Amino acid sequence: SSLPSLRDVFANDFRIGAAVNPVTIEMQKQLLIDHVNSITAENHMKFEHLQPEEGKFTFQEADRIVDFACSHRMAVRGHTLVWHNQTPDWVFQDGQGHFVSRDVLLERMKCHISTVVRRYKGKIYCWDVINEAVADEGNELLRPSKWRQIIGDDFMEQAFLYAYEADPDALLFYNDYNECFPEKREKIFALVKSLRDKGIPIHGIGMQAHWSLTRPSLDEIRAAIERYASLGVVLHITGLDVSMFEFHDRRTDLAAPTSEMIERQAERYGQIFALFKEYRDVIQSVTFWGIADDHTWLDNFPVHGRKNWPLLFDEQHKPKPAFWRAVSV
């Protein structure tokens, strides 16, 4: 009540978002209403939750998310159309269980993108069209995937063009994680630059920002922002969280964060939002992958069955020390 509202604090800088589903919308309703002006579906706008079988569209959960957002004047980011994960097997198969033609996968991709994007036209202002296509390791530019396998390397071009035709007023994003590690950063840059150079309607890069207390460094975040902004795209931070564990830290028996963890996280969040505010001219939206520590996918990834404390509010929805540093930049 005397607490500052995130969206108001950053009114002149960027929207503040949260990834939700119908359960967490209920469980965290007041936090969302008090703090965010933007909503993303954590799972219920992915392919498997929209077209689980060919011709069977299940919009019910996505609809509730959108209805919530509209009834509280929140923008909506659509997530996500084309991705190597959470896409049912039928998409790539024929009756015989073999892989489909390039042309058949294109028709399925187009049908899906047109049905989904047209339904929410005028309520969803941007879409993560392509998710995580760039390789996370090695020196190949692109990760392997059945989309890429079957269609070829121009599947991303096609997807953006399909999405643009379905709603040409939407901002279309390439979305990815580890976006600030230099070698991956240069792949993302090179990929997006190539698409823009062919006139493909890609308007933005989504920086997932699934970050740790240490990685990436502030200098790596700054360099990535400037590298991407130089392409003329808009930047969204799309899944911000700050894990208490580094990647190598697979501990399962921490029942609570240490006070050192909590303190360093507050500092880390303060520094990060200072950096975001500095680049307010190119960052238009900052979405957390959740909103309070009672729900986070980091509880079970990358270690199943533990607990993480990655967000600005604790499990009782009370502001953490990271909250105070974040709003005071």
Ligand X SMILES: O[C@@H]1[C@@H](O)[C@H](O[C@@H]2CO[C@@H](O[C@@H]3CO[C@@H](O[C@@H]4CO[C@@H](O[C@@H]5CO[C@@H](O[C@@H]6CO[C@H](F)[C@H](O)[C@H]6O)[C@H](O)[C@H]5O)[C@H](O)[C@H]4O)[C@H](O)[C@H]3O)[C@H](O)[C@H]2O)OC[C@H]1O
Shortest reach from residue 122's CB to ligand X, in Å = 24
Which of 136, 219, 226, 249 binds ligand X (CB under 6 A)? It is: 136
Q: What mask, x for binding ligand X by CB under 6 A, covers residues 55 to 94? A: ----------------------------------------
**How far is residue 80's CA from residue 210's CA, in Å, rounded to a whole number?**
17
Contact segment (CB under 6 A) with ligand X among 27-35, 129-137, 143-151, 221-229 equals: 129-137
Q: In degrees rounded to 5, what are phi and psi of residue 286?
A: -130, 110
Bridging pattern class, strands 15-20 and 234-243: unpaired
Q: What are the strands, taking DSSP E only, across 165-250?
A: 171-176, 204-207, 210-212, 234-243
**How far is residue 114's CA from residue 130's CA, in Å, rounded to a whole number?**
15
Tell me if 178 contacts ligand X by CB under 6 A: yes
Chain position whose Cβ is nearest to ligand X: 297
Q: What mask, x for binding ligand X by CB under 6 A, covers residues 210 to 229? A: x-------------------
Which amino acid type is present at position 245?
A: F
> Interface residues for ligand X in 270-309 (CB under 6 A)?
297
Which amino acid type is present at position 180?
A: C
Tell me if 42 contacts ligand X by CB under 6 A: yes
| Helix boundaries (H) for the chain | 6-9, 22-27, 29-35, 47-50, 60-71, 102-120, 146-151, 155-166, 182-197, 218-229, 259-278, 321-326
Q: Which is nearer to ligand X, 257 or 310 (CB)?
A: 310
Q: Which is nearer to ligand X, 13 or 68 (CB)?
A: 68
Specify the residue for token string 């187009």.
110
Q: Which is nearer to ligand X, 165 or 294 (CB)?
A: 294
E strand or H helix at 128: strand 126-131
Q: Which is nearer to ligand X, 13 or 175 (CB)?
A: 175
Shortest reach from residue 83's CB to ligand X, in Å = 7
Burial track 161-195 (b if 16+ CB lie within 10 A, e otherwise): bbbbebbeebbbbbbbbbbbbeebbebbbebbbeb
Q: In degrees rounded to 5, what are phi and psi of residue 209?
A: 60, 50
5: left (phi over 0), alpha (psi -120 to 50) or beta: beta
Length of the chain: 329
Q: Identify whether 52 is preceded by a cis peptide bond (ω within 30 of 0).
A: no
Tell me if 246 contacts ligand X by CB under 6 A: no
Tell me the β-bridge partners of 174.
Answer: 130, 205
Shortest reach from residue 102's CB to ligand X, in Å = 26
Shortest reach from residue 266's CB to ligand X, in Å = 21
Tell me if 208 contacts ligand X by CB under 6 A: yes
Shortest reach from residue 40's CB to ligand X, in Å = 9
Which of 204, 239, 270, 310 binds ligand X (CB under 6 A)? It is: 239
Which of 38, 131, 158, 285 binds ligand X (CB under 6 A)? It is: 131
Shortest reach from residue 172's CB to ligand X, in Å = 16
Q: Which is nearer to ligand X, 173 or 177 (CB)?
A: 177
Q: In degrees rounded to 5, what are phi and psi of residue 300?
A: -120, 0
Shortest reach from residue 19's CB to ligand X, in Å = 7
Contact segment (CB under 6 A) with ligand X among 130-138, 144-152, 155-163, 225-233 equals: 130-138
**How far is residue 126's CA from residue 172's CA, in Å, rounded to a whole number?**
6
What three-state secondary structure class fits 5?
Answer: coil
Binding footprint of ligand X on the chain (CB under 6 A): 42-43, 131, 136-137, 177-178, 208, 210, 239, 247, 297
